[PDB]
Amino acid sequence: SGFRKMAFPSGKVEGCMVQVTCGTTTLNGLWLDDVVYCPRHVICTSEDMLNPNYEDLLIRKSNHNFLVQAGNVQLRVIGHSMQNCVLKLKVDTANPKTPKYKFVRIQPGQTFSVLACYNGSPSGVYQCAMRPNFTIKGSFLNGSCGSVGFNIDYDCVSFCYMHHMELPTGVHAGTDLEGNFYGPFVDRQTAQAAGTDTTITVNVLAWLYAAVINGDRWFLNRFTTTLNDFNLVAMKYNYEPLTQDHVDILGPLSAQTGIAVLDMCASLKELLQNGMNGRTILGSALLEDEFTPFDVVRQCSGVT
Amino acid sequence: SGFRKMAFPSGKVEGCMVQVTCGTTTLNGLWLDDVVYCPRHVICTSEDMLNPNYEDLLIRKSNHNFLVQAGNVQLRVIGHSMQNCVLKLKVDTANPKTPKYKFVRIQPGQTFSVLACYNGSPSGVYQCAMRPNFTIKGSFLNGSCGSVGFNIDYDCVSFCYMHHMELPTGVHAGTDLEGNFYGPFVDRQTAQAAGTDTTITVNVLAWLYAAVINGDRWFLNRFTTTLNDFNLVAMKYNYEPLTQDHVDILGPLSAQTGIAVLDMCASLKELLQNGMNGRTILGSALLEDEFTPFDVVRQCSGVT
């Protein structure tokens, strides 16, 4: 028993982190096979970031200008190319620690682990979610760019995020490993405001199921609701609309606990309308939305 | 910017996890050098756990009864001994992945990362604290015993916890790597109730400093207090008494923010007396106490 915000074990990803320096900028790179992936803004000076023309800046860079260091040993760069907002630096050595991997572009509401790195060295690992406004609420200081987000399924690492920037509001924006930003964000130091940060309703319901499984049941009530009735309340509280796909995904949790999805929606509806009255659920005084139904099943079953 | 409950990168510890089976019980072991450490209750059947005589049960076990598997390869056990509540299984092969390590016995209030494992395979990593009642609030299912807690200082892993049991209240108890339980707990399936779970005051103050650094400042007030005045309020709310040692440890955070420790205590005093009024601090509606002052400095400075 017990339910924690758990990250995937990070070892497989730690073996892929390298330091990339171009001119006076140093950030992190991800070394998989004979390619090092890093944010293209490694070629920028803080001044260039105001209005960078990446194709123009890249013409002034050659293979020898990209310094790639794995631990204390230098990698030889034999090619470089820009794909969207990432640079792909071809090196002469395949990473011996390359795990089985995929590049995936996640949907908002999905969770992943971030291995925060500085100078190619891992500092910590935490779990987060792609917010519905395509930002993430991470913990990233200067030098953390190029740190990656990932999920692990047995022995295959699915990389989904690479860190690029912090908006002036302290939230984070990045790309998938193809270099495409999540959301409308651009790698320029300009006014970029995030949209509404709505709550991931299906994740809140999954976490309420996790609470019931782990013994926290005070919030269960005698009511039920419909998808349309629940959604009138979800809209009012800036919660994402719940669809039948979300109800289907919650099926296994509904079956395990014996609590119908719409009954759990009615509990959530009363929590939204009345608050927690100074009570807590799974050690939280807020309705937690960074656990997917898959995360709840995995943690409650012990998937390794 | 941003502040997350961050765990240490777990790779160094993942390379130490093995599966230990004795009879029909399978749990995790920690392989460092040529020794595998695991809870001594690996020799028990669920029935033995009611009133186990470990010395008597161990006489019926020989080296060949301890099956140790690292990945898919078997380790040869050439010796075994019991030290307090852990068994030390001497194997014929030193773990090639043994990192630089120490065994430390932590104090209540200190934090560490747990690599939850099942069948010797890592499932996830999370951060927690040794509670003042010597329990931890983890996420452990059956098969997780032998999972370890640790801290990392550059390249040295300090192991501080090994998981042994879950109390009937869903909280967790374990030992240091010398096999001595934290608190009064025993490895027997009997009535063991935890004492008061007080709040780690110095950690709450550290987290309020982290909030100020990261932009959450609404709770700062025009007041100050004294250690004795603050402690009258801390006692009332089941908070640990704050000492001058705690004030000294908060010195660097006080210096960085320019907010005197006793002024932050006065903010905390008003938060205890008035609540948050539906507001949040660092994405929490509760006063977070599982970040030490060292954790705040580390995360706010980017230690790798």
Ligand SMILES: CNCc1c[nH]c2ccc(F)cc12
């Ligand atoms: C969601 N609107 C009411 C509200 C504000 N804050 C909250 C925290 C928890 C909860 F269950 C409800 C609330």
Ligand SMILES: CNCc1c[nH]c2ccc(F)cc12
């Ligand atoms: C600590 N006693 C009041 C109280 C109950 N619950 C709380 C949650 C947050 C906070 F700042 C204060 C409170």
